[PDB]
Design a protein around this ligand. Structure first.
Ligand SMILES: Nc1nc2c(ncn2[C@@H]2O[C@H](COP(=O)(O)OP(=O)(O)O)[C@@H](O)[C@H]2O)c(=O)[nH]1
Ligand SMILES: Nc1nc2c(ncn2[C@@H]2O[C@H](COP(=O)(O)OP(=O)(O)O)[C@@H](O)[C@H]2O)c(=O)[nH]1
Lengths: 254, 84, 446, 444
């Protein structure tokens, strides 16, 4: 229908050659098609929602999800890459969604199609490597969105997978310190029975309490560094990119 | 990355001590004055490893912080100072 | 990692605080006082997660993950009525009718002991509902007797029955230096249990909480029932990242793993910058500086050469990191840390709920935070001074056997002595930590 | 710099009624607190914020605390300003009426209510970010008036040690009431001399000497002549309200007006004006202002010593006229041998919404000065005081509260208050002498 209208308009001015009026038709056509396109992208393809989902998941903007994946995949992560039950990851992803705020997309029209694009991949880092090293968590896009968005194209720079791995290393270490600190707390807790054992205990406990402090040195390192990137580089550049993408929202009175 | 690799390794050594400490406590549940001094030996041995690693880590971390600080860019000065 | 959280109210203090907590929480999640979603079902997208605090049923009713205990049915009933349709009545427990005061800690401890089976059965029933449970929020409020007594006995039962679940306790100290003649009883015995069993705790001072409530909500009509809103919001600040997650924490485990260097020293001291709740919209730069200002403390700590330790805050609102880093640098110069420590200071995201009223983000001064400092000891000492006199003289030691056999089995002298060692060690550990040599026992153990 | 008006006693509240009425006219705000302007033009070219808490709503809340012992004066104002005033900033000494016309009574009620009064003051300070100061409107010899002013001053001078609290002092013409009124004046004055910021004197005798010529006689009444008081107050803040680019602050204003830590009581003059203004030139207005006939203080001196002379001319001022007037004024002002005579002249603005503005091709203005004779306003009160409170009923039987813990706290408070006032007078005189600085600047 669109083309027919414009066809006619250009036919009407065909006698003019260009004579500016041609430009005027274009300016209107430009506006109409671009705005129409954007309505579609965010109405049928949920473009912004996809953008946020990618940031939330691949750039790890959502903490609950990432932890949900790790717990569900702990055996996978510990298991060598050489023999992984990779199909288990389908189950892990499904649960990680149910275990996180993401389930709000999974259970709703307009949103389920976005969440369904998430799909894990395994990196070949060599024999003896484990799921903790080789899990990369990808996302699959199809045109029309694969034509708009930057994606991990097979011949591209794989920006997201590389970033994922960077952030992943922080998550792995953070996972482990939380797990380990709870193991520590479980044992330091047995400080009541000591009334019948103190001669062989006072020294181990004093060392363990100081060890918790040493452990905290590493946790704060990881917390500070991970946070630095996320709250200084990623969020800042992200907020700027959405501001650009949000210009169509007429978000500013300025 | 090396600092991150180090923290991964720190967890493994802390875990080894946690398991040693666990068994020392189990042995006391069974025999109050036993809990073999060999376990205390291993505990202390793995602690020596943590401490050695701790110090080595800290020196590398210092260098990292120093390199961020003296490269230029206020962000690196701010980050480096915040790691102290 | 994060998981579901259960709130336990051991007495009227906690049960009153619950009005403030559940109102503020429901407010932030667009849940009404009837437990129902306040949002029209024309919009179904949500980006929060109510699961850790409410069961959401098929009628979009949100049932609080909380169990309320008392000896007085009226406080819980007041909450049930205030919020009729919000709370599940089966989560209401009341001790056999009776009364106690001062010696009410002993009585509390007894009702806990006598009824551990009934209270624990209610707790297990709620936990058994779900898989990913991660900890409890305990409203202990040490100043109260049966509140603290019950809380002390339940704490012991829970920390060993649920060794994997983090127990965080909220406890406010007495505003009166004269009631301490019996509140020091409650305190020494309750504090023993908190020190031995709790994983984390936040300490409050009713004198400071009352003064601040009156100063911020500028009004001479100062009350515990006005003040509890501050308690509700320190809690909502803390759980901000869980309820409204981002990428920084969203877990009790995560924050404690970064905020508590030793399980021995897990008593935190809260403060805040002005906020609205159930014109001073200063930059986050200023918020950070204002947050360590003694006038904003919810604990009277004096802050004379403030005794350092791990610092963590949240700035509520959408603010710029450059201000955060500039303020942090200044804070690093203002607040000291031991050389053995990591000298860590942290800032959370502070995202606001999408269901709140609109305000400019440049005016988002608001926030509440906690520091791990030895400046908690001075609170413990005011009790300590009071209790190192009544037990020493034997005042009221002949008036505590309120069903728990405190006097019947002559545990009178032993409960004091063991509890006294425990509270002293906490204070000594806080102080030992003040020196640079604190870690020498492991780091120069050549 | 935000300013909070303090309206103390019925005089202070009546003066405020006139002040706020003029402000509502200057900044076209109705009595309901709403802008009278269309919102088709969102730029107002003024700033109401220092005097009003412009809301997010079309509401301009006067930054004022309304204080009395008699709630009816405040109500008369609130009932006129129907939405304009915020009633939560209203305090009334409801716990007993003042026991007659004694500053001590006003003081005693303010003292008991000091915390409540301050709480209202801070509720309003909480609505100001850049709080700078206060404007106190009061009679000098009223019980509630001067007593409340005395309490407010003591409370505020210590609570806000870095803020500016100025005073607008209304002086009754001396009459027989002076047997009480002179101590109300004197003891409350002691408090002003010791604690207050720059103070301006309004002599009711002059308000009448003038109103007998410019007000619709017979109604030339002192509560009617509040328009003259209002004219000066609004003229002073005109540089703040419709700011130009020279003087935009109270601290800037006083930088050339206050020569020493001593509190100075300044003497205003004004001519010509319109209220419910056609001067010929600024040349003439400036020259006309250096004449006691335009003064609101009956100093009545033919050759007073002037210090710190300042004036503001508002309108289409020609700088040549100003220069010529300065040229002749420079030659006919008495001032000490130790200080070059610097007259400060500021040019202000007419409100963009002033109904008169479209036809103003004429100028008018105000002069303020430090006069060695300003203290003449206290002369009759002082002479009375010396004869009356030396030993009369007037010394002790009008005292309540701390002033009458014992007769000793009366006998000495009154004698000391007189001495504080005597010292004030002596210093205004010392400043008239060349020796004031000849025994300073060459002392080396
Ligand atoms: N902060 C706060 N304290 C309370 C509240 N209700 C009671 N209290 C505390 O109650 C203490 C006295 O014991 P109480 O708990 O009331 O009696 P109980 O039934 O034996 O536990 C006092 O120190 C109060 O601080 C409340 O809602 N807020
Ligand atoms: N110019 C002027 N004088 C006033 C006004 N109201 C009252 N007076 C004077 O105020 C003096 C005493 O103080 P006032 O406030 O009136 O009485 P109080 O409320 O009992 O303290 C009297 O001598 C009156 O001449 C007013 O609005 N303007």
């Amino acid at each position: 229908e669109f083309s027919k209208k414009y066809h006619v308009l250009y036919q009407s001015n065909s006698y003019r050659g260009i004579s500016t009026n041609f430009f005027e038709i274009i300016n209107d056509q430009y506006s109409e098609i671009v705005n129409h396109t954007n309505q579609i992208l965010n109405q049928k393809f949920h473009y912004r929602d996809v953008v946020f989902a990618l940031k939330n998941i691949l750039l790890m903007g959502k903490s609950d999800f990432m932890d949900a994946l790790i717990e569900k995949a702990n055996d996978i992560l510990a298991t060598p890459s050489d023999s992984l039950p990779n199909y288990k990851l389908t189950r892990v992803l499904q649960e990680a969604v149910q275990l996180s705020s993401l389930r709000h997309l999974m259970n709703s029209p307009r949103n389920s199609s976005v969440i369904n694009g998430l799909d894990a991949r395994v990196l070949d880092l060599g024999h003896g490597s484990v799921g903790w090293d080789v899990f990369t968590l990808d996302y699959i896009l199809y045109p029309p969105l694969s034509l708009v968005l930057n994606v991990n194209r097979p011949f591209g720079r794989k920006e997201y997978l590389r970033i994922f791995n960077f952030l992943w290393r922080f998550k792995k270490n953070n996972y482990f310190y939380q797990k380990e600190m709870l193991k520590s707390n479980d044992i330091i807790r047995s400080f009541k029975k000591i009334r019948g054992y103190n001669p062989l205990i006072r020294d181990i406990i004093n060392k363990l309490s100081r060890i918790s402090i040493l452990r905290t040195q590493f946790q704060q390192f990881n917390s500070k560094m991970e946070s630095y990137y996320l709250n200084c580089i990623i969020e800042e550049n992200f907020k700027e990119m959405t501001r650009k993408l949000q210009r169509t929202e007429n978000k500013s009175q300025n | 990355v090396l600092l991150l690799n180090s923290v991964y390794e720190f967890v493994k050594v802390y875990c080894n001590l946690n398991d040693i400490g666990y068994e020392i406590f189990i042995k006391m549940n069974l025999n109050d004055h036993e809990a073999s001094n060999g376990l205390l030996g291993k505990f202390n041995t793995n602690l020596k490893e943590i401490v050695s690693q701790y110090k080595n880590f800290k020196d590398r971390l210092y260098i990292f912080r120093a390199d961020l600080k003296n490269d230029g860019d206020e962000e690196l000065f701010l980050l480096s100072k915040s790691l102290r | 990692m994060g998981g579901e959280i259960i709130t336990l109210q051991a007495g009227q203090c906690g049960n009153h605080v619950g009005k403030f907590l559940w109102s503020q929480l429901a407010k932030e999640h667009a849940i009404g006082t009837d437990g129902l979603s306040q949002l029209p079902d024309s919009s179904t997208e949500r980006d929060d997660d109510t699961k850790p605090f409410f069961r959401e049923n098929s009628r979009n009713k949100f049932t609080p993950r909380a169990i309320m205990m008392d000896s007085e049915p009226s406080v819980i009933a007041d909450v049930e009525n205030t919020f009729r349709g919000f709370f599940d009545p089966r989560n209401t427990w009341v001790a056999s009718d009776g009364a106690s005061a001062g010696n009410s800690w002993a009585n509390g401890y007894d009702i806990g002991t006598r009824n551990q089976d009934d209270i624990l059965n209610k707790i297990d029933k709620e936990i058994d509902s779900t898989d990913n449970f991660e900890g409890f929020q305990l409203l202990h409020s040490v100043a109260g007797g049966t509140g603290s007594g019950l809380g002390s006995n339940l704490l012991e039962a829970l920390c060993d029955r649920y060794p994997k679940k983090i127990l965080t306790t909220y406890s406010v100290f007495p505003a009166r230096s004269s009631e301490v003649v019996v509140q020091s009883y409650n305190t020494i015995l309750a504090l023993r249990r908190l020190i031995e069993d709790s994983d984390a705790t936040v300490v409050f001072d009713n004198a400071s909480l009352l003064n601040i409530s009156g100063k911020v909500f500028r009004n001479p009509n100062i009350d515990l029932q006005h003040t509890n809103q501050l308690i509700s919001t320190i809690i909502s600040s803390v759980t901000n990242s869980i309820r409204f997650p981002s990428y920084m924490y969203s877990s009790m485990s995560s924050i404690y793993s970064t905020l508590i260097p030793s399980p021995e020293l897990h008593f935190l001291s809260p403060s805040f910058t002005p906020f609205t709740s159930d014109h001073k919209g200063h930059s986050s730069y200023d918020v950070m500086l204002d947050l360590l200002d003694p006038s904003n403390s919810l604990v009277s700590t004096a802050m004379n050469n403030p005794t350092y330790f791990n610092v963590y805050n949240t700035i509520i609102g959408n603010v710029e990191p450059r201000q955060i880093s500039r303020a942090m640098t200044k804070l690093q110069q203002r607040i000291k840390f031991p050389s053995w420590s990591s000298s860590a200071m942290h800032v959370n995201i502070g995202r606001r709920s999408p269901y709140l009223p609109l305000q400019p983000n440049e005016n988002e001064v608001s926030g509440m935070m906690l520091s791990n400092m030895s400046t908690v000891v001075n609170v413990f000492e005011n009790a300590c001074n009071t209790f190192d006199k009544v037990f020493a003289k034997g005042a009221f030691l002949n008036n505590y056997n309120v069903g728990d056999l405190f006097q019947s089995m002559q545990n009178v002298q032993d409960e004091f002595a063991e509890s006294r060692e425990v509270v002293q060690s906490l204070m000594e550990d806080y102080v030992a930590a003040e020196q640079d040599s604190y870690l020498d026992d492991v780091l120069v153990d050549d």
